[PDB]
């Protein structure tokens, strides 16, 4: 994130422990929901 | 000359018994043995195991010349045999059985390594930090 | 006896040599034990094969393998290797001939048998370590076809391909028109079919 | 002069001898010939650029053994003797190695197989025991 | 496995990812970041190459073609006759302490294609290694236009204090051997 | 000079001791610009020839026509080729194969071994 | 019952542990004394004392039976009686013209230097294995008894094949080193050629 | 297993010897009685059963299943006991079948 020309808005991770240290507990709530959403969509089945 | 169509034939003798038993004394080529320097040699049974069940100890030119240890052939000729073929003045060969085959290897001279006083301890600390100075402090 | 034969033939004992003067030689192993070295592995290997097929070395109990890229030859005489019978093909043809087949049919009153057939040296038992080295042909058909095919080097031949099947997979008909897990499921149910 | 001293005369004379590996049946025939003072004859024939060594058996002891020479540049051998008179001596240096090979090929094997029978055959029990009561 | 683009041995898929995620793993099997680019770097391949190069954790070991250690006390008589021109090149490079530099020499050979891909310069490396180990590690290097890329390394000391005051607080470590430790660490540590 | 000059300065591990036959290590003579190799357990020392004592990562060992022993040609399970002319003898029958190593790392290049007694000659393509 | 085969050396990767590579050899002709099986010959990885030489992935060691701690293989060779490195390397390298292998073996020889004599090398093995006691000489006798009987019993149990056993260790080092240069491919864990 | 392994195991390496602690507190004139035992040839009957009477009979593997016996056979071995006391006599060896 700190490097020049790297977008500090959209840059994201599949890791969760690191997301917590850098971005703080609300960002984990979003990213963790996204990562779970991502495994479920792959497998093709939908979950509400 | 005749040397290019030379044929030679000798009789072979194998005496049932001999007063002296017959042995092999073998050296590695790598050991670069030189028998011309062997002004004197001693041959005694080893003393580590402290008679017919022990390795040999060979001391040449005594403590100044080279010293070797002799170990008995561990394998046994059960499907083969080893023989010595010798020429005799009558014009025949004599063949003698190998009673034993001994493997001779160099012991070292004043190489000197205590390896007991604190070398095991120094090893715990050993970082290949030194090598010459410890051998000298003796 | 294998150790005896090698020792009289040409194999030098480990203590007779200085390795740095003869290390180039092929190594010999007997049941995972390093017995010695040899300077002509192809002849000796050919000779051992010739003896085993001649019955001078116990065929079913002796496997013999040469690994040429490491210049060593290991031989095993231990119990517990799985081995199967295979035809010996030589000069790119079968060594078994129609004369033997008529001899086998003759057994309704003849004492000629499978053991006689092995002694003819037209079949050998080949374990999985040795099966790594052979050039096995699927059928005599392919072995004939070779005049156009890519390989013309076969050494052994399959006595029949359905033999790769165990007892229960053998009760089931046309198993190759089955999708493969179906064959496993039947072999189980086959033990549960009462009779 | 001492009991622990080795005689080096042979070494100093540069005495050379040959070392030959031989099959058991030949050593066994020599063990059956005992010490009569002959077991056969050894013949050596050399050409312009090739040398051929062999041994031929006594007709009586039978009632061609080719020799293959082995390099001695790999190990240095001499021989010493341990006399009954407790006087050790170095007899000479080994200047040649060789191996005695059989001329018969397959027939030989039968003898060997017979030899195998001689080495291998104590009763591995097996004969059951039919039955006993006492 | 689901074949896609260049990537793939990426992001564990399915139940093994559910277990990895739900356990709050400190050591994920395949951790990654999806980095987005801006300005010209978001549309130009070569600009993206430049930022990527800064990001890519390259270590000197990754970069080095070859290493050698040579016994050469005085450069002005180099054991490697072809090196002789750098001595012409580097006689004015602290000319006093050529009387002080150790007779043990380290030589490194660099690949020109691999060095190009990182778009790195020889002066940045000399300066990086010099700064990391300190002024003790005396480094000099070659002309960038040579067909062979080479780095020439000796080891220097602190001059004044080293006159065998007591016995030299080093315990007489061999200097070649110390030079290997420099080579071990120099490669494994240096994060150019 | 030229960059064509091969890179084999003499790696060299053994030329060990001449007396006790143990390994030699470099050590300095600051007085004569000479390298010496000494046994650590004895007083024996001798000057070195090359100033080189260690190299690492030729990275490109090409091990393409070395270690691959010629007896490989007898292997029946390797593909014989009608592709002719060994580059030494006027006979076809080259046996060929990929890599045969773990250090090859990604090679698809074929290696050819003539199999008749007149060569034993090997060559890449 | 299916098991992994006996008295045969396999070189396999074990990247999850501290060992870069391992040579395993389970020893026993099943039809002899039927005791046990052990020997592991291991290439170390992942480490550095600091300014030793840093390079740990050449520091070859050997696990022996009954011994409580890993010992460098060269020490075992010196305990078998060989004292000169060229002779250990002759037992090891065969071809003699592989300088690369010679430097690969070189740090192990550098570690050997403190125990260059057989008796102390045996006492070193003794302390690494036996219970602590002032019986140094007896400890050497115990150490001698392990290396003669308990190490590679399928090679022999007597004085008379003690030399032969040293050749087989060199083969285990050789086979291990061959996999580590990558000149030889690794032995698969599940190849029936390796089972009984 | 029967034809080789069992015979091999009892022939192999368990010869045993035993010697009482004679000449305790005193003694002298002689040499502490000692005894040596070694096992040789091995024998294995056809499978046999023994009725409560003690009468042995040929068992049939079906009979073994209905009555719940155990289809097995009795094993016998050649044993020797061998004296070479410390002086007065070296022979007095006896053959048994057990």
Swiss-Prot record, chain B:
Post-translational modification as stated in the protein's UniProt record: Phosphorylated on Ser and other residues by TAF1 and casein kinase II-like kinases.
Modified residues (Phosphothreonine): 114
UniProt induction comment: Up-regulated in response to enterovirus 71 (EV71) infection.
Superkingdom of origin organism: Eukaryota
Disulphide linkage map: none
Coiled-coil portions: none
Subcellular location: Nucleus
Stretch forming the signal peptide: none
Assembly: Heterodimer of an alpha and a beta subunit. Interacts with GTF2F2, CTDP1, TAF6/TAFII80 and URI1. Interacts with GTF2B (via C-terminus and preferentially via acetylated form); this interaction prevents binding of GTF2B to GTF2F2.
Stated role: TFIIF is a general transcription initiation factor that binds to RNA polymerase II and helps to recruit it to the initiation complex in collaboration with TFIIB. It promotes transcription elongation.
Protein family membership: Belongs to the TFIIF alpha subunit family.
Protein name (record): General transcription factor IIF subunit 1
Organism of provenance: Homo sapiens
Gene name in the database record: GTF2F1
Shown residues within the full chain: 5 to 180 of 517
UniProtKB/Swiss-Prot annotation, chain C:
Transmembrane segments: none
Positions bound to RNA: 192
Subcellular location field: Nucleus
Function (record text): Catalytic core component of RNA polymerase II (Pol II), a DNA-dependent RNA polymerase which synthesizes mRNA precursors and many functional non-coding RNAs using the four ribonucleoside triphosphates as substrates. Pol II-mediated transcription cycle proceeds through transcription initiation, transcription elongation and transcription termination stages.
The family this protein is said to belong to: Belongs to the RNA polymerase beta chain family.
Oligomeric form and interacting partners: Component of the RNA polymerase II (Pol II) core complex consisting of 12 subunits: a ten-subunit catalytic core composed of POLR2A/RPB1, POLR2B/RPB2, POLR2C/RPB3, POLR2I/RPB9, POLR2J/RPB11, POLR2E/RPABC1, POLR2F/RPABC2, POLR2H/RPABC3, POLR2K/RPABC4 and POLR2L/RPABC5 and a mobile stalk composed of two subunits POLR2D/RPB4 and POLR2G/RPB7, protruding from the core and functioning primarily in transcription initiation. Part of Pol II(G) complex, in which Pol II core associates with an additional subunit POLR2M; unlike conventional Pol II, Pol II(G) functions as a transcriptional repressor.
Name of the protein in question: DNA-directed RNA polymerase II subunit RPB2
UniProt gene name: POLR2B
Curated annotation (Swiss-Prot), chain E:
Location(s), subcellular: Nucleus; Cytoplasm; Chromosome
Posttranslational mods: The tandem heptapeptide repeats in the C-terminal domain (CTD) can be highly phosphorylated. The phosphorylation activates Pol II. Phosphorylation occurs mainly at residues 'Ser-2' and 'Ser-5' of the heptapeptide repeat and is mediated, at least, by CDK7 and CDK9. POLR2A associated with DNA is specifically phosphorylated at 'Ser-5' of the CTD by CDK7, promoting transcription initiation by triggering dissociation from DNA. Phosphorylated at 'Ser-2', Ser-5' and 'Ser-7' of the CTD by CDK9 (P-TEFb complex), promoting transcription elongation. Among tandem heptapeptide repeats of the C-terminal domain (CTD) some do not match the Y-S-P-T-S-P-S consensus, the seventh serine residue 'Ser-7' being replaced by a lysine. 'Lys-7' in these non-consensus heptapeptide repeats can be alternatively acetylated, methylated and dimethylated. EP300 is one of the enzyme able to acetylate 'Lys-7'. Acetylation at 'Lys-7' of non-consensus heptapeptide repeats is associated with 'Ser-2' phosphorylation and active transcription. Regulates initiation or early elongation steps of transcription specially for inducible genes.
Location in chain, cross-link Glycyl lysine isopeptide (Lys-Gly) (interchain with G-Cter in ubiquitin): 162
Family the UniProt entry places it in: Belongs to the RNA polymerase beta' chain family.
Name recorded for this polypeptide: DNA-directed RNA polymerase II subunit RPB1
Biological source species: Homo sapiens
Swiss-Prot record, chain H:
Location of the protein in the cell: Nucleus
Domain of life of the native organism: Eukaryota
Transmembrane segments: none
Stated role: Catalytic core component of RNA polymerase II (Pol II), a DNA-dependent RNA polymerase which synthesizes mRNA precursors and many functional non-coding RNAs using the four ribonucleoside triphosphates as substrates. Pol II-mediated transcription cycle proceeds through transcription initiation, transcription elongation and transcription termination stages. RNA-dependent RNA polymerase that catalyzes the extension of a non-coding RNA (ncRNA) at the 3'-end using the four ribonucleoside triphosphates as substrates. An internal ncRNA sequence near the 3'-end serves as a template in a single-round Pol II-mediated RNA polymerization reaction. May decrease the stability of ncRNAs that repress Pol II-mediated gene transcription.
Sequence similarity: Belongs to the RNA polymerase beta chain family.
Protein name: DNA-directed RNA polymerase II subunit RPB2
Lineage: Eukaryota, Metazoa, Chordata, Craniata, Vertebrata
Parent-record interval covered: 50 to 147 of 1174
